[PDB]
Amino acid sequence: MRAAVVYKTDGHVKRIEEALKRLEVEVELFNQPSEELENFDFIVSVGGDGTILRILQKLKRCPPIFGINTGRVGLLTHASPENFEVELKKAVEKFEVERFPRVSCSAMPDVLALNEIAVLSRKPAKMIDVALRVDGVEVDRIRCDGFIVATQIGSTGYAFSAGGPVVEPYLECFILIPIAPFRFGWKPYVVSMERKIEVIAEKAIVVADGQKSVDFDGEITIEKSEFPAVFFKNEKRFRNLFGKVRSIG
Amino acid sequence: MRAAVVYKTDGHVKRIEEALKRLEVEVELFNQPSEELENFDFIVSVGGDGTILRILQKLKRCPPIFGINTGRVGLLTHASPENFEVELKKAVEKFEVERFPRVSCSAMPDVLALNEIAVLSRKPAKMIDVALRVDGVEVDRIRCDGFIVATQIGSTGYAFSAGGPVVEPYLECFILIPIAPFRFGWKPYVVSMERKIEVIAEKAIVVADGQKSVDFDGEITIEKSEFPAVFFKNEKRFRNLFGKVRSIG
Amino acid sequence: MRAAVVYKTDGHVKRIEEALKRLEVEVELFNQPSEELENFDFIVSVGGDGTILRILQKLKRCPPIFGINTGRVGLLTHASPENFEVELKKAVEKFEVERFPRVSCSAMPDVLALNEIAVLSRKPAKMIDVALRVDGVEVDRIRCDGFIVATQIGSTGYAFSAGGPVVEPYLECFILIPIAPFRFGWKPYVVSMERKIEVIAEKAIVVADGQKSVDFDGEITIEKSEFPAVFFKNEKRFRNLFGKVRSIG
Amino acid sequence: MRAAVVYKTDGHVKRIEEALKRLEVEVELFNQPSEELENFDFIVSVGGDGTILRILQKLKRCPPIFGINTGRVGLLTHASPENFEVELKKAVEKFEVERFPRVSCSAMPDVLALNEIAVLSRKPAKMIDVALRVDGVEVDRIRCDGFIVATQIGSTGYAFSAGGPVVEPYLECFILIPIAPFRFGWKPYVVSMERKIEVIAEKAIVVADGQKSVDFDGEITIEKSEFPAVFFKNEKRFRNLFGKVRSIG
Ligand SMILES: NC(=O)c1ccc[n+]([C@@H]2O[C@H](COP(=O)([O-])OP(=O)(O)OC[C@H]3O[C@@H](n4cnc5c(N)ncnc54)[C@H](O)[C@@H]3O)[C@@H](O)[C@H]2O)c1
Ligand SMILES: NC(=O)c1ccc[n+]([C@@H]2O[C@H](COP(=O)([O-])OP(=O)(O)OC[C@H]3O[C@@H](n4cnc5c(N)ncnc54)[C@H](O)[C@@H]3O)[C@@H](O)[C@H]2O)c1
Ligand SMILES: NC(=O)c1ccc[n+]([C@@H]2O[C@H](COP(=O)([O-])OP(=O)(O)OC[C@H]3O[C@@H](n4cnc5c(N)ncnc54)[C@H](O)[C@@H]3O)[C@@H](O)[C@H]2O)c1
Ligand SMILES: NC(=O)c1ccc[n+]([C@@H]2O[C@H](COP(=O)([O-])OP(=O)(O)OC[C@H]3O[C@@H](n4cnc5c(N)ncnc54)[C@H](O)[C@@H]3O)[C@@H](O)[C@H]2O)c1
């Protein structure tokens, strides 16, 4: 059963090589992520949340991702170097998985987002004029540095920083929130991920998970896609949510 | 096919009788809400959001509610006096109904909120030491004027005022947000409604939908209930959500 | 020269009684604060920030206060118990002070607040309709759980939890912020302390420093009194502000 | 005595030429702002707050400015097309004058900001890593899209959007708020304007009243300048502050 190990640097990759060898698993090494990753049964990412997002950008069909975290913190990950040898043995032996939806922009045709599709100002410190509508209905219009269309997974990223609610990973929703809105009152809008979001702005940019961005004027459509992100049932995912969150930055 | 027509003041009630009579519907006027309301094919509420919440307490089994708003803004209502006669007709001829869940606190067994359960301090200008726990797990421990456990429907009520997000009516979930938290960082949590909430504080009261209130010491659980609120299908519920929210005062 | 040492618990009192001994200063023990504290060259409180606020309710003319934070955290205190020996000697030999304004009320005539005056609902879970003017101009009319007229000192207290800004101690100003405002957009106003505040509300109370409360209806005015809180000089008051504020819980 | 009318479009400029003609004031017209505007007894900006910022950028020593808002809402302006005639005459013969301070920054040294000095990310959709200090003190260290060092006049500007308090125009003070901070727990700080602000970023840019901006890599210093902004006295500046803020959009 084949497995890929992706890594930022040489950190701990030797012990993971020998961790998978003990468990009867073919292993191949990957400095950078490629579209070849979907020829393997699973993937063991080594670096952090950031590393996982760069992997998913080279994946439509997503083989299960285990996630060793090098740094200090990580919400998408499964283990650390201190204790990964144990948690990997469990991960592969059960082979239980979970799947979180990935949305897609209309102007960035095949690149999918797990966290969000942000819509920012092309020039920094300049303000764009954003009009939002979902399922046809005019939801809002507002001047802001940007606008975020995040899934619940990404409710803990940019969205969090704009004032967003912490939404547990299992409840499946969009969070719609502006960045530095220039208006007296405003409120985050949480809606079902079955709807069709639309943003309309001139002189703007669109960014999937802080990774692929394109320029666009006019309008874009963001909806749920057919290809989710597959991880490895992290039984404690929920209980760990309120604590990883308590200690961001 | 008979009907109950509940009212606070003598609003447009001469007219609502006369529209109900013309649609060949028997009418029983109700000076105030009653348990007796269970025995009607539907209830026309005539007043505002508050009129409907009161109605709901005195129901377990809930006939369809056509709420009419004589005030400025009502998120639960289908029409105003200008349009009520056309909508009431559409509503009763098709008879399509929809239902949003009601929640249940330990302290008051046979009572049900549609908006929220709020745990506040018995005495005012005073903080309680609230501890929250969703599904066995510890999620928070904060000091505050109170804590709010609210459905998406009540996202636009009390919790809205405490800094909470506006969640659309068709996304079943809980919204757990404190009133006046004494702490550097805090966040509103939005979790699934299929979960077991538990609130722990001393010298406090619990309040279901701003109606029934009861002193409590120690522990309560809040959970989803088996007898929900029933209104007639509102084709434009989602559409108006965003306009009405901006006129809240 | 003479001093009154005010305490709640009789823990660290024999250590402090002997520190003041070897400083040519006469001592008098005070199990609870009193109007008699005015007859001393200074005061040494022994407890939290509350031990201080409780002291100032019995002072009009205020001799300098040296605060010893017992357990706890506090931004009105001058020293912990395991360094106070030194800090007292430095504070009484230098004998250097600084003063912060206290405000007054209409409804409670002889009473003075260092932190804030909070207007709240009389019955909890009920919101009142507050209507605020400063120097005669209407500023606002909001439905809320309460309203806080704070000073820069008490901007780290009740107004901090209502969503206020951290204002430094040396900038004299009012902070005007509501508690659970049922309104789409709202904002705290920071204004000059030389202005005459005026809150209007029915079915309410007023509370100076969470210490004294009286029912009221109609209007009250808050003004800057001529009798300031007086403390020894804390040079590190400003540099400690930011690290204490982070640890608020 | 002669004056300079500065406009952006040809809105009500003929009618303004004629008002100054009836007041025996020789007028020169300005397609846009020049250093040249220094040699006049007063100035009549015609457009908005933004037009006034542009004028001020070309001015060290500032002659009285009389703003006519042709737009929707102007914190900095005196009159509308309806009542400019009345008010222009009133204030020219009274010749009273207010002085709100402007602020210099240590990277574009001879430029001046009434509103703020914003330190932004150089590329967009990337967050920088701002370290804040004031009078040599570590007040914060935070990952964010940017950081506003605002004055009270610019507290209804960019800082307002970032989550900041409304500050009366006559309470002199800095305001230290971030844009999109990635941290569970932040708060805007309001400190004295006599203090020395200092920001340490990397991969950043500094902006001043949204006009002049230059790349910077290291550490800058914001501090109260020698030459302020000068407007004719608005007797209704304070009064109109609150209704104008409520219609910021
Ligand atoms: N808060 C902000 O000012 C800001 C700015 C740009 C991007 N982002 C977020 O960062 C993510 C990656 O973008 P980038 O590579 O440009 O920046 P990045 O990866 O260099 O830094 C963003 C930080 O967010 C963390 N992170 C990523 N996904 C997260 C999640 N789902 N929940 C909690 N934390 C998470 C990472 O650990 C990292 O420390 C994007 O998905 C976006 O949501 C945030
Ligand atoms: N914002 C606050 O400070 C505050 C305080 C207490 C109660 N409430 C809300 O009021 C409800 C009823 O309590 P009460 O009888 O004590 O007061 P109430 O019925 O008189 O007043 C509540 C106010 O909010 C409106 N409202 C009611 N339900 C709403 C909803 N679901 N979404 C948006 N607005 C709604 C009402 O029309 C009224 O203006 C509670 O369930 C709670 O949600 C809000
Ligand atoms: N945040 C809230 O929900 C809330 C509620 C009531 C009172 N308070 C504050 O507590 C003060 C005293 O009232 P109480 O005795 O009823 O509550 P308290 O004194 O029993 O508890 C208030 C907490 O805040 C601390 N505190 C007091 N003044 C402070 C200040 N200026 N800056 C930072 N922390 C401070 C206290 O040491 C204590 O930990 C009031 O002046 C009010 O500001 C806050
Ligand atoms: N809210 C935001 O996302 C944002 C972004 C960039 C700049 N700004 C503000 O705009 C100012 C000028 O920037 P620009 O020329 O790039 O855009 P601009 O001047 O065209 O737009 C800023 C908006 O805010 C208004 N404004 C300016 N000063 C104000 C004040 N003191 N109070 C209330 N409103 C005010 C302007 O008239 C305009 O409507 C800056 O000084 C900054 O304060 C705000």
Side-chain angles (χ1 to χ4, degrees), chain B residues 120-122 124-126 143 145 156-158 160-161 180-184 207 210 245-246 248-249, chain C residues 72 120-121 124-126 143 145 156-158 160-161 180-184 207 210 245-246 248-249:
Chain B
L120 335 164
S121 178
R122 256 168 239 190
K126 293 289 164 192
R143 304 172 61 196
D145 288 52
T156 48
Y158 214 152
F160 182 98
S161 326
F182 192 47
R183 204 224 262 139
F184 189 53
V207 190
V245 133
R246 288 218 226 75
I248 275 171
Chain C
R72 312 257 61 210
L120 292 108
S121 169
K126 229 85 230 172
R143 217 139 43 108
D145 269 23
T156 39
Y158 215 156
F160 183 90
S161 311
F182 190 55
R183 196 227 269 155
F184 184 58
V207 197
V245 137
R246 277 178 291 182
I248 278 163

Side-chain angles (χ1 to χ4, degrees), chain C residues 58-83:
Chain C
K58 316 262 145 168
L59 301 186
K60 253 155 140 246
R61 179 180 82 266
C62 186
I65 294 161
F66 187 93
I68 299 166
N69 200 49
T70 187
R72 312 257 61 210
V73 170
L75 39 102
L76 281 33
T77 54
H78 285 273
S80 66
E82 47 264 297
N83 84 333

Side-chain angles (χ1 to χ4, degrees), chain D:
Chain D
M1 201 191 238
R2 58 188 277 148
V5 164
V6 192
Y7 64 90
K8 177 72 153 133
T9 48
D10 310 75
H12 310 277
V13 189
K14 202 217 174 73
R15 247 188 96 214
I16 296 150
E17 248 187 292
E18 284 168 321
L20 283 163
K21 181 258 299 97
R22 275 191 238 96
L23 300 163
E24 267 173 354
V25 187
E26 319 206 351
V27 305
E28 217 199 308
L29 293 185
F30 276 79
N31 226 8
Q32 73 202 163
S34 203
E35 261 81 28
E36 215 65 75
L37 294 159
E38 277 199 320
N39 300 311
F40 296 79
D41 310 297
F42 71 98
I43 294 169
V44 176
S45 166
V46 179
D49 294 358
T51 302
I52 284 184
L53 291 170
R54 293 165 160 77
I55 284 157
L56 284 172
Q57 271 282 285
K58 301 282 172 222
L59 288 176
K60 250 166 62 123
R61 213 188 62 272
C62 194
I65 310 197
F66 182 94
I68 293 172
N69 182 66
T70 59
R72 190 188 133 223
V73 249
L75 278 283
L76 281 42
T77 62
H78 304 58
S80 107
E82 311 324 300
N83 70 315
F84 96 82
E85 286 233 321
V86 169
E87 301 289 307
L88 188 272
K89 182 215 191 303
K90 237 200 246 149
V92 88
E93 72 134 39
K94 264 197 153 176
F95 220 82
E96 272 172 47
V97 141
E98 298 164 314
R99 294 171 113 111
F100 305 119
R102 285 191 286 187
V103 119
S104 120
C105 148
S106 152
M108 358 166 230
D110 298 59
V111 326
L112 299 167
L114 215 209
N115 281 345
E116 75 278 303
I117 303 284
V119 173
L120 277 319
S121 172
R122 195 170 281 153
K123 257 182 303 216
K126 261 55 165 101
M127 69 214 298
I128 54 164
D129 193 310
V130 171
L132 180 60
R133 281 204 282 99
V134 35
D135 291 348
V137 173
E138 315 285 333
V139 313
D140 224 15
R141 243 202 99 82
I142 195 166
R143 290 220 270 4
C144 61
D145 284 24
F147 207 86
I148 318 290
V149 182
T151 76
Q152 79 270 188
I153 303 298
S155 71
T156 52
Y158 207 164
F160 188 109
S161 310
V166 170
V167 191
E168 175 189 334
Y170 301 109
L171 185 103
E172 285 191 21
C173 54
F174 275 123
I175 295 180
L176 320 171
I177 186 161
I179 315 185
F182 192 57
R183 183 212 291 170
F184 179 96
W186 58 275
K187 226 89 160 100
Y189 303 108
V190 180
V191 297
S192 165
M193 206 178 277
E194 297 313 327
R195 295 177 171 284
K196 188 187 246 195
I197 290 26
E198 266 186 80
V199 190
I200 307 95
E202 284 284 84
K203 305 206 76 142
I205 184 158
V206 193
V207 190
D209 296 355
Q211 317 306 280
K212 291 289 182 7
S213 61
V214 228
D215 290 352
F216 102 94
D217 252 36
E219 132 187 306
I220 65 181
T221 282
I222 298 146
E223 63 178 77
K224 191 203 208 230
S225 102
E226 169 77 340
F227 336 86
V230 179
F231 304 94
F232 287 104
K233 202 213 164 194
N234 217 314
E235 262 122 32
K236 309 195 194 239
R237 205 152 207 120
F238 190 79
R239 153 160 277 136
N240 292 357
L241 197 223
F242 303 86
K244 283 177 165 182
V245 132
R246 198 131 8 135
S247 62
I248 277 188

Side-chain angles (χ1 to χ4, degrees), chain A residues 66-121:
Chain A
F66 194 83
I68 291 147
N69 171 20
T70 303
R72 191 203 50 137
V73 168
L75 271 91
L76 308 202
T77 80
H78 296 271
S80 99
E82 312 310 286
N83 74 330
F84 88 87
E85 279 196 284
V86 154
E87 301 298 315
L88 225 193
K89 212 117 160 159
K90 297 166 193 256
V92 74
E93 275 182 314
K94 304 166 159 198
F95 225 85
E96 245 154 276
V97 296
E98 309 165 308
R99 312 186 178 76
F100 306 116
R102 247 136 36 105
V103 298
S104 72
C105 210
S106 88
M108 255 173 351
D110 299 342
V111 6
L112 318 156
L114 199 232
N115 272 351
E116 82 290 308
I117 293 281
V119 174
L120 296 100
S121 174

